[PDB]
């Protein structure tokens, strides 16, 4: 509360470490469905169904331009990518499996780096 603060957690490396995680996600062999924004002109249903589209290139640009106020808003956009994938894609499809694999991959890097 006013003039009463928990000890300061060192966040000075957070930007660098989120950038490293994001590099690892970008270079994973199963990243291909997620590298660029889904083409809203060419994929029926996507625009109407997926209210907040998100992809790794968009996260990379946000990260590079100071549009993440903290590491939790970064994690929210990464999880949005996988939540959108599960919304639109069957679990037993190449894309559906890719999205589960990538979410698993991310969540391990996230825990190991920050928790």
Curated annotation (Swiss-Prot):
Superkingdom as given in the UniProt entry: Eukaryota
Domain (Bromo) ranges: 9-113
Locations listed in the record: Nucleus
Tissues showing expression: Expressed at varying levels in several tissues, whereas a smaller transcript was expressed specifically in testis.
Quaternary structure note: Component of the BRF-1 ISWI chromatin remodeling complex, at least composed of SMARCA1 and BAZ2B, which regulates the spacing of histone octamers on the DNA template to facilitate access to DNA. Within the BRF-1 ISWI chromatin remodeling complex interacts with SMARCA1; the interaction is direct. Component of the BRF-5 ISWI chromatin remodeling complex, at least composed of SMARCA5/SNF2H and BAZ2B, which regulates the spacing of histone octamers on the DNA template to facilitate access to DNA.
Function: Regulatory subunit of the ATP-dependent BRF-1 and BRF-5 ISWI chromatin remodeling complexes, which form ordered nucleosome arrays on chromatin and facilitate access to DNA during DNA-templated processes such as DNA replication, transcription, and repair. Both complexes regulate the spacing of nucleosomes along the chromatin and have the ability to slide mononucleosomes to the center of a DNA template. The BRF-1 ISWI chromatin remodeling complex has a lower ATP hydrolysis rate than the BRF-5 ISWI chromatin remodeling complex.
Family of the protein in this entry: Belongs to the WAL family.
Protein name in UniProt: Bromodomain adjacent to zinc finger domain protein 2B
Species of provenance: Homo sapiens (Human)
Entire protein: shown range: 2054 to 2166 of 2168
């Amino acid at each position: 509360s006013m003039s009463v603060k928990k000890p300061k957690r060192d966040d000075s490396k957070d930007l660098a470490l989120c950038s490293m995680i994001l590099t690892e996600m970008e270079t994973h062999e199963d990243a291909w469905p997620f590298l660029l924004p889904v083409n809203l002109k060419l994929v029926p249903g996507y625009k109407k169904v997926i209210k907040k589209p998100m992809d790794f290139s968009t996260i990379r640009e946000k990260l590079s331009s100071g549009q993440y106020p903290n590491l939790e808003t970064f994690a929210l956009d990464v999880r949005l990518v996988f939540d959108n994938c599960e919304t639109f894609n069957e679990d037993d499809s190449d894309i559906g499996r890719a999205g589960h694999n990538m979410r698993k991959y991310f969540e391990k890097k996230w825990t190991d780096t920050f928790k």
